[PDB]
Structure 1
Amino acid sequence: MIREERLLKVLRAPHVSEKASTAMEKSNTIVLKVAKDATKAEIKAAVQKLFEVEVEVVNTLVVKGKVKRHGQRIGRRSDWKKAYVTLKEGQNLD
């Protein structure tokens, strides 16, 4: 049982990319940016409540931040957690 408030905080964004699109189309799997602390179960819960859609399974991974250079000064982008969430057969997501 995850708290409503917690759930709302978990899910950061949808991730747009070719791969993501492919996943959506073929495998019925949505690619989300989620909180770095968000566990799989929590993510699933969030998905179910907040998008109103049955979840088969969630795979997560941590994306490491790229090191960049703004002019002369070096600086690193933040790490962030990506989640492939596979929706059950016949579940169409808006």
Structure 2
Amino acid sequence: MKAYDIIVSPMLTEKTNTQRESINVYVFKVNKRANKKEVGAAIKELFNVTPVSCNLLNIKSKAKVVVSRKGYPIGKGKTSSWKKAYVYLKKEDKIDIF
């Protein structure tokens, strides 16, 4: 898996924004098959900077209840689960694309 199938997209959220502003942390949606090592390698190849460390989470799928055309519960649908990455850079390092 090339370093392009690893990193999916960043996250722009209030929590991630404050974290990035304060302690220089970047949060990404990554592929579920990645791990710490190739996430770090992918960050290096993509943005030409080596991260101090990486943390990964598995976000479970959010369940929804599906109702008929009239509308009344007939089953349980679900969103897609995904993997979230916190990436820690050195205090001088930055990522510009954001």
TM range (shorter): 0.7 to 0.9
Amino acid at match of 1:65: S
Rounded Cα–Cα distance in structure 1 between residues aligned with 2:26 and 2:94: 11
Rounded Cα–Cα distance in structure 2 between residues aligned with 1:52 and 1:69: 44
Which runs of 5 or more structure 1 residues have no equivalent in the other structure?
none
Rounded Cα–Cα distance in structure 1 between residues aligned with 2:61 and 2:40: 24
Rounded Cα–Cα distance in structure 2 between residues aligned with 1:32 and 1:61: 11
Task: State the structure with more CA Rg.
Answer: 2
Amino acid at match of 1:12: V
Pairing partner for 1:42 from 33, 38, 55: 38
Aligned to 2:88: 86
- Percent identity over paired residues: 38
How many pairs align? 90
Amino acid at match of 1:18: E
By percentage of residues, which structure has more helix? Answer: 1
Q: Report how far residue 30 of structure 1 moved.
A: 0.2
Alignment root-mean-square deviation, CA: 1.3
Q: Secondary structure at the match of 1:93?
A: coil
Aligned to 1:55: 51
Task: List, as ranges, runs of 4+ consecutive aligned residues in structure 1 with deviation greater than 4 Å.
Answer: none
Rounded Cα–Cα distance in structure 1 between residues aligned with 2:2 and 2:66: 35
1:75 has 2:77 as partner? yes
The normalised TM-score by structure 2 is 0.84
Which runs of 5 or more structure 2 residues have no equivalent in the other structure?
69-74
Amino acid at match of 1:68: K
Amino acid at match of 2:55: N
